[PDB]
Design a protein around this ligand. Structure first.
Ligand code: CL
Ligand code: CL
Ligand code: CL
Ligand code: CL
Ligand code: CL
Ligand code: CL
Ligand code: CL
Ligand code: CL
Ligand code: CL
Ligand code: CL
Ligand code: CL
Ligand code: CL
Lengths: 216, 216, 216, 216, 216, 216
């Protein structure tokens, strides 16, 4: 990664194993993405590829990921074209799609772009593309649909709500969505026992209010 | 986090795993909060969101947390309004509710606010809001009420007292409360055998005095 | 903690877990205290409270601890009074009992006192108070009395001596005491077989001398 | 390895054990190579030999590796000859094949070449040769042929695709190849149930499109 | 410990646990001493006491240790007396026996002595005294006598030799002794089968020579 | 060890445990030697003795090691004599055999020799002597002879080759030897089934070629 002068430094073995072990244990649950992002702070494209390449298995997901990167790389090339003339020896060349992905660019060039003034954030751009691909994978890997998440007759309300927002996080729900969902759908899939109470609270009720009410 | 010049540095993988493992093992017992606070020393809002987002499961608690942050963000916006004019290129903009929560602010802006002279402590303000939400969750997750914590006929007094203050800590008791509780309620829920002795000590008796007396 | 300029630095996650795991495994055996002291080198009151607050369970001991701190805080206030006038903006205020305990003082103020010339060692003063409270807890948590520690007919002398000084350490024996104990009480609770030999050594005999003699 | 002045520093014990444990657990699965590359960032030939020599077992693979290095060393000597005159005391000598491999060169000389201006990247050249040898080993160690990777009548499409690209990665498929393979061969080895759908998508279909279609 | 200006730094939690775990696992086998010495490089008397005090159990050994320190402290006081006049405010006082042991001296004073020019090596002197006490403990804790270490009729010679020098190391054998022992006693306690060969080698024979001869 | 000014620094607890655990698990397999060398980069004689002394068990090997060091120390003294006059106070004395081994030299003197300009590499010289002794031990500890390593009728060729070069590495085979061995002896100890094919390849055949041929 890059760290403060701004200097490249090689990825740590603890960071490498941390990421690999998370994928082994968690597969593609939603929380793996913000963990990925955290372990990859200030990461170059090489660092990012290193983290992705070190994962054994889930090679279907890894292939789908490369497809998403191609689309973003293609769109980048459309919005950011570059001439194919002779490269100027003194100063850096302009990065195209595959350079940001780290397939057609050296570590020297990646550092050059990230540490320049003003910097070309090729690591931030590429991480962006990866999170987009990882979100597609989480969406696809989500076991259950939100419609099949309903409170069991003898299930604690807290457990039902945990499964509800666990599922809802996997299915890529915006806060706009999540907030409407809690108002609408959360109540309707609850127990008849619970739903009787929950209606009594009526409108705008907090999840705090709802969960204390149905503790019974 | 921010560390001494005051510079941002990326959260460590040991800190990340430390927090995640504590939630896996302890769930929402009272001691998880001061641990959270310790692992998040000098943390930016991004760091704080990273720590919260990396937790898998307890998504009911995570939703309730976001609700508490909205309330604090709303109250912040009331007490600290800002104009919607054109942003001055040279100098920082003024942070509103969602900027402190890290949803509508970049890492650059978060560092800018925290490292300024005088600093706008957006990390300390946001951590404040989170602890308030976490305390609500601990309160709700507390298994037993203090009224059901009573000394068993064949239970050591120390074990009874451990359960008593364990429960009492979860139910959000101030030192004002805790000190009155030890005087009043601790004695009344003890064994008849013990209570006979404990009264003999009478008033103002220490917990040290009480525990040595009932060792028998 | 504070480290060399003298600068505050946040407690490490390895130090935090180290302390928590020691309490989980050892409870309140005597050796937990010098371990506590070692993990808390140069610790501020906040650091010290962090270490104490992170411990789950033993909440009876934690309450007794707070009682000991109140007594030391009260005695400190008696011996070190302070005026309740307006606080001088430029320079630090004088610390009272609860400021040293970290309940009524900020981290800024704690650093200010510890890093001043001359320094007000609020961390050393507070650690002092804590060790006093922890020693009370170890004393109370000691399973057996020294009088019930006697050599079994078929017990190796080394094992008997280990239990003897293990118990004796828990019961808060000064070196003045320990040295008299080895002369007097250690010999009398030994086996008749052993005691026959041990008397033969007579007076001033070393533990080295005693243990080699009874190896048989 | 070499790190920023550019200075040699000895390989870490965490890095050493990290590499050894990966070989113990994973043997020669494809992901071991980018892990090797990551643990060996800025590595000297000595560091690289240290990492290779510390591996117990797979001595057949280690021998094949040395054979690949000889070929690259021989080709290097052909393309980069050097005179056998007297060595100039003041300045460095020119590196030949075995010097890059670290068999006939000291650590001093390896540092000298890597830290010079302009540098002779003997670590990068040697790592290159090693990855070429490791890829030969992975190819040979691949358990199954891509032709025997077919979707079982009662196998989830995702599992079939994971085995497909797992196998395909071991057999050294270029992106040129992989992209043609997904178009052609992936579809033909699927279930009759699946293949009926997959054809319906027809041409250019994404793996994202294919996997959602056959989720059924 | 003290490290390079020469500055005190607090003992690490990894070093603390490393030492504690070694005593838990190994008890007082000979190799524990050079491990102790290594974990205590540049250690102050406080650091040394911290390491000794953190050990739970073996309190018989810990008591014997304190007895050895008293003897060395007493001998130090005899050979290095000091006046009991008023202490000079500006400059350090002269260390007596208990000051080196860390019982009657502060950390400030310990640093003062160790970092002075010329330095008074109170850490090296005290470590010296401790190793002397630890060697007494290892001697006493040695399970078997060298006379009972004999080669079993069906025992490999290597295993016999391992037990021989394992025992011999515990019983505090100098190289003067060890070298005479290999010549004399090692041969006589071997098998009749082996001893027939071993004599054939006769005088001055290496352990290398002896072990290859009896491999049969 | 010594690290960049060139300064001594105390061996790490992670390095110490790393070495000890490797000997516990691997005993004296060939790969333990390059691991030893890696953990001991820039090590002083004290560091080297620390690493050797911390090993519990294999005391037969440790004794044989000391014998090899004596021989190298004796040869050093022959080739590098020194006068027994009065030592010059200002400047370093010249190191003799036992000084390099760390038995008759202080840490100060060891640092003095290693950090001088020009340096006397007492750590490199001593490590040299140790590897020579460790290679003797590996040779002796090798379980099987290369003559008894033959391909089983129903054994995969890869497994046979792994055992072949595993054994061959223990028996101290030079690359001159190893390369002749693969040509000659590897083929003759293979299966009749395999040997029929392997001859067909004939002369100069690679191990890569041989292993792919007999995969069947
Ligand atoms: Cl790869
Ligand atoms: Cl793979
Ligand atoms: Cl997230
Ligand atoms: Cl989740
Ligand atoms: Cl708390
Ligand atoms: Cl608790
Ligand atoms: Cl080797
Ligand atoms: Cl091997
Ligand atoms: Cl103590
Ligand atoms: Cl103890
Ligand atoms: Cl030793
Ligand atoms: Cl031993």
């Amino acid at each position: 990664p890059i760290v403060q002068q701004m200097v490249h430094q090689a990825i740590s073995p603890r960071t490498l194993n941390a990421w690999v072990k998370v994928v082994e244990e968690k597969a593609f649950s939603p929380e793996v993405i913000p963990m990925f992002s955290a372990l990859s702070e200030g990461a170059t494209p090489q660092d990012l590829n290193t983290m992705l390449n070190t994962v054994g298995g889930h090679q279907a997901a890894m292939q789908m990921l490369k497809e998403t990167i191609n689309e973003e790389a293609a769109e980048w090339d459309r919005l950011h074209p570059v001439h194919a003339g002779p490269i100027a020896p003194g100063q850096m060349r302009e990065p195209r799609g595959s350079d940001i992905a780290g397939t057609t660019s050296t570590l020297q060039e990646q550092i050059g772009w990230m540490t320049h003034n003003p910097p070309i954030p090729v690591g931030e751009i590429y991480k962006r593309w990866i999170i987009l691909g990882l979100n597609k994978i989480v969406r696809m890997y989500s076991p259950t649909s939100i419609l099949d998440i309903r409170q069991g007759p003898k299930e604690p309300f807290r457990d039902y709500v945990d499964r509800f927002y666990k599922t809802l996080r996997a299915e890529q729900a915006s806060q706009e969505v999540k907030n409407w969902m809690t108002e609408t759908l959360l109540v309707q899939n609850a127990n008849p026992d619970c739903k009787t109470i929950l209606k009594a609270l009526g409108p705008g009720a907090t999840l705090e209010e709802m969960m204390t009410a149905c503790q019974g």
